[PDB]
Design an enzyme around this catalytic site. Structure first.
Site, PDB file in Angstrom:
ATOM      1  N   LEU A 129       0.810  -1.301   0.108  1.00 35.80           N
ATOM      2  CA  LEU A 129       0.010  -0.002  -0.129  1.00 35.80           C
ATOM      3  C   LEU A 129       0.936   1.305   0.074  1.00 35.80           C
ATOM      4  O   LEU A 129       0.265   2.323  -0.751  1.00 35.80           O
ATOM      5  CB  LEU A 129      -0.953  -0.126   1.196  1.00 35.80           C
ATOM      6  CG  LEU A 129      -2.110  -0.941   1.027  1.00 35.80           C
ATOM      7  CD1 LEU A 129      -2.924  -1.043   2.217  1.00 35.80           C
ATOM      8  CD2 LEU A 129      -2.979  -0.912  -0.105  1.00 35.80           C
ATOM      9  N   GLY A 130       1.864   1.159   0.748  1.00 34.95           N
ATOM     10  CA  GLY A 130       3.006   2.492   0.889  1.00 34.95           C
ATOM     11  C   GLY A 130       4.265   1.928   1.270  1.00 34.95           C
ATOM     12  O   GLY A 130       4.145   1.008   1.899  1.00 34.95           O
ATOM     13  N   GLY A 148       7.762   3.584   3.092  1.00 32.97           N
ATOM     14  CA  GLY A 148       8.870   4.617   3.371  1.00 32.97           C
ATOM     15  C   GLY A 148      10.367   4.454   3.463  1.00 32.97           C
ATOM     16  O   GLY A 148      10.728   3.474   2.628  1.00 32.97           O
ATOM     17  N   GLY A 157       9.929   1.797   6.646  1.00 34.94           N
ATOM     18  CA  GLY A 157       8.654   1.262   6.972  1.00 34.94           C
ATOM     19  C   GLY A 157       7.942   1.164   5.876  1.00 34.94           C
ATOM     20  O   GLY A 157       8.243   1.438   4.717  1.00 34.94           O
ATOM     21  N   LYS A 158       7.171   0.069   5.785  1.00 31.63           N
ATOM     22  CA  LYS A 158       6.121  -0.285   4.757  1.00 31.63           C
ATOM     23  C   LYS A 158       4.702  -0.565   5.166  1.00 31.63           C
ATOM     24  O   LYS A 158       4.410  -1.093   6.379  1.00 31.63           O
ATOM     25  CB  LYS A 158       6.539  -1.577   3.873  1.00 31.63           C
ATOM     26  CG  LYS A 158       6.867  -2.890   4.819  1.00 31.63           C
ATOM     27  CD  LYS A 158       6.990  -4.024   3.656  1.00 31.63           C
ATOM     28  CE  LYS A 158       7.197  -5.334   4.354  1.00 31.63           C
ATOM     29  NZ  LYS A 158       8.258  -5.524   5.473  1.00 31.63           N
ATOM     30  N   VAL A 159       3.650  -0.330   4.320  1.00 32.84           N
ATOM     31  CA  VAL A 159       2.184  -0.724   4.668  1.00 32.84           C
ATOM     32  C   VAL A 159       1.736  -1.681   3.771  1.00 32.84           C
ATOM     33  O   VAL A 159       1.816  -1.391   2.442  1.00 32.84           O
ATOM     34  CB  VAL A 159       1.368   0.535   4.878  1.00 32.84           C
ATOM     35  CG1 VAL A 159      -0.130   0.268   5.110  1.00 32.84           C
ATOM     36  CG2 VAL A 159       1.855   1.451   6.284  1.00 32.84           C
ATOM     37  N   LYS A 197       1.048  -2.187   9.208  1.00 31.65           N
ATOM     38  CA  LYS A 197       2.459  -1.283   8.905  1.00 31.65           C
ATOM     39  C   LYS A 197       3.575  -2.035   9.619  1.00 31.65           C
ATOM     40  O   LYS A 197       3.723  -1.962  11.028  1.00 31.65           O
ATOM     41  CB  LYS A 197       2.041   0.312   9.599  1.00 31.65           C
ATOM     42  CG  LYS A 197       3.535   1.162   9.802  1.00 31.65           C
ATOM     43  CD  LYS A 197       2.914   2.591   9.742  1.00 31.65           C
ATOM     44  CE  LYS A 197       4.127   3.410   9.363  1.00 31.65           C
ATOM     45  NZ  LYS A 197       3.595   4.908   9.443  1.00 31.65           N
ATOM     46  N   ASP A 223       3.939  15.787   9.157  1.00 32.42           N
ATOM     47  CA  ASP A 223       3.854  14.986   7.782  1.00 32.42           C
ATOM     48  C   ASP A 223       2.401  15.255   6.935  1.00 32.42           C
ATOM     49  O   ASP A 223       2.141  14.155   6.208  1.00 32.42           O
ATOM     50  CB  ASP A 223       4.330  13.705   8.061  1.00 32.42           C
ATOM     51  CG  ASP A 223       4.925  13.109   6.491  1.00 32.42           C
ATOM     52  OD1 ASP A 223       5.050  13.716   5.775  1.00 32.42           O
ATOM     53  OD2 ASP A 223       4.897  11.802   6.595  1.00 32.42           O
TER      54      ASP A 223
END
Ligand code: R4S
Length: 280
Positions: free
Chosen positions: A15-16, A18, A21-23, A42, A129
């Protein structure tokens, strides 16, 4: 209710992502019949200490325009479990729905973001953010603030939080006090909202993004010198231009978010009232 077993978290897609980090979209299916609910997970690609702090913030937030905390998944390691918003972020949703979303609907989203942000401030938090990529679409009528990775708690009887780390930051959404002194006030989130409103009004057009616009102003800059040139541009009184087809009344509220001094900027409550006065 709040505990999710790793073995039942069935990975579907990313989904996303960083820096650390990852979602991921998961289906929590303890019955093993593919009927369990879809959740946003997350995880980490210490950063564990940060994620634990993020979990604690989101657990403590309960609001209509704030992504719902569901629980945790413990491995030493930890994962944050949230609700899944199928339409994704405004950054992805708006370029595909340019003929569906009119000005009235964009202002209803701005009210929603401001309500979510005002509640965040009432809890003494600074998001740090606020960008369209972090505003998630529940449906065509509702949005939610969906990431709290950089959120800090302002100490009681303090007006700001000072960032002490070596972490990356969304400098193109940052107020002068953030850029010059690493100081984050509730008024710093108002500035970021102003930038987020600009993105929302341009339907998150890639060529009209703060980074693209500011980089066409600044020029070839390099990672080291980006912040000093950005500060210089802002000190000169330069701001993001009025998006195409944005009425003056809307741009005026946007400019109230971009006063150089934090104490001169509008509040989130004044923004809510301001946008609601325009909704007929
Ligand atoms: O990805 C990150 N944070 C989040 C805000 C991003 C997307 N997130 C979430 N996304 C969704 N749904 C959804 C649907 N489609 N898409 C793809 C992008 O449009 C995202 N629901 C809940 C969420 F929590 C969480 C940090 C860097 C790791």
């Amino acid at each position: 209710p709040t505990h999710f077993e790793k073995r039942f978290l069935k990975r579907i897609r990313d989904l996303g992502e960083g820096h650390f980090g990852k979602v991921e979209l998961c289906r929590y299916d303890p019955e093993g019949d593919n009927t369990g609910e879809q959740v946003a997970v997350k995880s980490l690609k210490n950063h564990i200490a940060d994620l634990k702090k993020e979990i604690e913030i989101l657990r403590n937030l309960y609001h209509e325009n704030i992504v719902k905390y569901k629980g945790i998944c413990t491995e030493n390691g930890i994962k944050l479990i949230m609700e899944f918003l199928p339409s994704g972020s405004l950054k992805e949703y708006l370029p595909k729905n340019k003929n569906k979303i009119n000005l009235k609907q964009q202002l209803k989203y701005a009210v929603q973001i401001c309500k979510g942000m005002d509640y965040l401030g009432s809890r003494q938090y600074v998001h740090r953010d606020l960008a369209a990529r972090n505003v998630l679409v529940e449906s065509e009528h509702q949005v939610k603030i969906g990431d709290f990775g950089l959120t800090k708690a302002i100490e009681t009887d303090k007006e700001y939080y000072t960032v002490k780390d070596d972490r990356d930051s969304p400098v193109f959404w940052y107020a002068p006090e953030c850029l010059m002194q690493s100081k984050f006030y509730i008024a710093s989130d108002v500035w970021s909202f102003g930038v987020t409103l600009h993105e929302l009004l341009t339907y998150c057009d890639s060529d009209s993004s703060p980074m693209a616009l500011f980089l066409k102003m600044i020029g070839p800059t390099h990672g080291q010198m980006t912040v000093t040139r950005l500060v210089n541009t802002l000190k000169e009184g330069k701001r993001l231009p009025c998006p195409p087809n944005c009425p003056d009344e809307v741009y005026q509220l946007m400019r109230k978010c971009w006063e150089f001094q934090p104490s001169n900027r509008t509040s989130f409550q004044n923004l809510i009232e301001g946008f609601e006065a325009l909704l007929k």
